[PDB]
Amino acid sequence: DTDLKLVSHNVYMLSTVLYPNWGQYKRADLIGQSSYIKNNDVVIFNEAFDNGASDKLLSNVKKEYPYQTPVLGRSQSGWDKTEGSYSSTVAEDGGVAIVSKYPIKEKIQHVFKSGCGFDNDSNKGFVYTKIEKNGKNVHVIGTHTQSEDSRCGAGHDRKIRAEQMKEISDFVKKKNIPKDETVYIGGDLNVNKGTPEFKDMLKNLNVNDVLYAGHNSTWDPQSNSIAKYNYPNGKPEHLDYIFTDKDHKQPKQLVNEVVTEKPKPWNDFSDHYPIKAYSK
Amino acid sequence: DTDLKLVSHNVYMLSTVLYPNWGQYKRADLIGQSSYIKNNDVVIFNEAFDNGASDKLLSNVKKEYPYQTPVLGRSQSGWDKTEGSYSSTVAEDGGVAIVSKYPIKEKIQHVFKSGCGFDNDSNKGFVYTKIEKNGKNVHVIGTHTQSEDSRCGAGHDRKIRAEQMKEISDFVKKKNIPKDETVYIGGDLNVNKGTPEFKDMLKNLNVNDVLYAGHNSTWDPQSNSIAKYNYPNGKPEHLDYIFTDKDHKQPKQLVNEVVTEKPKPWNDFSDHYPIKAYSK
Ligand SMILES: [Cl-]
Secondary structure (H helix, E strand, O other): OOOOOEEEEEEEEOOOOOOOOOOHHHHHHHHHHOOOOOOOOEEEEEEEOOHHHHHHHHHHOOOOOOEEOOOOOOOOOOOOEEEEOOOOOOOEOOOOEEEEOOOEEEEEEEEOOOOOOOOOOEOOEEEEEEEEEOOEEEEEEEEOOOOOOOOOOOOHHHHHHHHHHHHHHHHHHOOOOOOOOOEEEEEEOOOOOOOHHHHHHHHHHOEOOOEEEEOOOOEOOOOOHHHHHHOOOOOOEOOEEEEEEOOOOOOOOEEEEEOOOOOOOOOOOOOOOOEEEEEO | OOOOOEEEEEEEEOOOOOOOOOOHHHHHHHHHHOOOOOOOOEEEEEEEOOHHHHHHHHHHOOOOOOEEOOOOOOOOOOOOEEEEOOOOOOOEOOOOEEEEOOOEEEEEEEEOOOOOOOOOOEOOEEEEEEEEEOOEEEEEEEEOOOOOOOOOOOOHHHHHHHHHHHHHHHHHHOOOOOOOOOEEEEEEOOOOOOOHHHHHHHHHHOEOOOEEEEOOOOEOOOOOHHHHHHOOOOOOEOOEEEEEEOOOOOOOOEEEEEOOOOOOOOOOOOOOOOEEEEEO
């Protein structure tokens, strides 16, 4: 009734201009065709940076999830409200967007005020949506927090992620949402499960941990072709989550299921080859 | 000036309803992206049966080849003229379509009158197009004749293929096309090269043999992943051709080149996996 079936998914669409050979396009189509993307109520996207592939993606899933938001921190247009340190003069956007099966009553973007090197030359932040499903109001916040970056002063990734999450949980309190409506928060939060920092994220976001299902890492270089190419001998991390603010209505038993769907490789175009014909 | 750069290609898109795990969709995208499909004047498609992937395909290539025909035998609409034993009560269409860089001044479909089992519960036949390039008229007939079928009475494959081709070469005589304009005929003709039947096809289609380049088979179980899956220990055939009616202008030196391009195919959606969230 009021509990949704969300999907978050960092989709690793880097600016096709600086990073040209990653089929950002080809993969946005692949996503549209996947099973996992079907039959949900709201989807949160992350690292959806590239304007083109951004569109390609949001477009594909427009049929089923008609109600969408801009991509966080791209422009001030199309948003009901724009708060925090939004900059026009920065390199990339927040790469966060929310699509939805049911009507979006309100959409608001928020650019984090704090930001560590390389990642702060962008409008990383969070997107808030009030959605109306079956007469009741529900709330979804998508975000993609500070990434672990080499540039960053040792320990800054965490100190800043903390500021950034406090920015979120603060936005929720001040938003005055009635205690009997659910508020979801989720996306690539860049904090590995079962670490010191995880305990902090729970407090800073003001959420409770949830129940997990399926795969036990979301960034897994070992079982995951693209992760593997980038960091061959790297340790898998569980970075993507969907929580619910603890001070508002809790869904019946909230689960996060990591889904490991992979596109079927086609190694040839057809069982036949093509004929070219010309006059030499 | 009047001679074209064609591509025919049987694309093995069976009805996604009876044959669902063949990425007919995923493959129609892959084709749009290939190299071989670029920089031609006319492309002929075959076994383009499924309505959905049919569209996906015809859509991808619309940019470069705007002028298209419907898929042979699907419906009577969109066709300037509809001759032969077209039926409405058959299972599948002819799966033949022609797209083109230059305008299509006339498009006509023809359903073969003869048909051998399994393959005859369908509107297999040929598509004719008059196309206008640089002021001159040129003519392209795509077709996909009777397939070698187990059901078929021993020897009927061939006897019907022959009727069907005579139906084409007859359509060409009675079409009153000017001897000084070229008439191309091509597609999976289901006739292996260097066999007895091959000599017949040349007479029945009223064409001359051409010069060959590149790979020497078009259906090759051994180098082609899909062929291999279906007929592991099967012998490679040359089945796809593009000839020109011998009683009309001949191109300067016609060549069929079998193109052995192979899609480099991505394996994961992102470096991250998707999170599904729900309340169980
Ligand atoms: Cl910007």
